[PDB]
Every structure is written in structure tokens, then in C-alpha cells.
């Protein structure tokens, strides 16, 4: 339930939210994890 | 404040949340928009 703020970016012709290593460590996110994305 | 569920994926050597066109339309997200990402 921990969260972080980010910006939608364009990478490889896709709209993505890049998750830096620091943010992964703070929120406890690994590849494959399910997340909730909310527009602010 | 609208939200959608997604999975952290790996693309271009980065950990990202791909946002499909349908999800962008439902949540009202454009590139550059600030979003909140919460681990479920």
C-alpha cells in the first residue's frame, strides 16, 4: 500500500511509468507485481 | 482520481508500467501527466 509519484513518459513507442530502483526499494516493487495507477 | 490495475514489466532494460490506450482513455492520462503508483 506504499506509493510514489511519477510522470507518464514515452519509451519504445509506448506510454509507460518508469519505476526507478530507489522507488522499487521504497514501495517494495519487483517485476511482475500488480500495482494501482491513479491520475493525480 | 480514476485508477487502473497493471503489472510492472521490463522493457528496454527498465522497470515500467505500460499504460494501454484504453486505460489512458478511461483514466484520462496523457504523456507528461503525474500519476500515483501504489503496490497492491
Q: Which residues of A touch B7 (CB under 8 A)?
A: 32-35
Distance (Å, whole) CA A19 – CA A22? 8
Instruction: Give the resolution to one decimal, in Å.
Output: 1.8
∠ at Cα B37 (B32, B38), nearest 5°? 170
Cβ-defined contact of A27 to B19 (cutoff 8 Å): no
Option in B11, B36, B39 nearest A40 (CB): B36
For the sheet with A3-7, list strands across it: A3-7, B34-39, A34-39, B3-7
Chain A interface residues facing chain B, Cβ-Cβ under 8 Å? Answer: 1-12, 14-19, 21, 23-24, 27-40
Cβ-defined contact of A38 to B2 (cutoff 8 Å): yes
Amino acid at each position: 500500500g506504499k506509493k510514489f509519484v511519477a510522470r507518464v513518459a514515452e519509451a519504445g513507442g509506448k506510454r509507460v511509468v518508469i519505476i526507478p530502483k530507489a522507488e522499487r526499494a521504497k514501495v517494495g516493487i519487483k517485476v511482475g507485481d500488480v500495482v494501482e495507477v491513479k491520475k493525480v
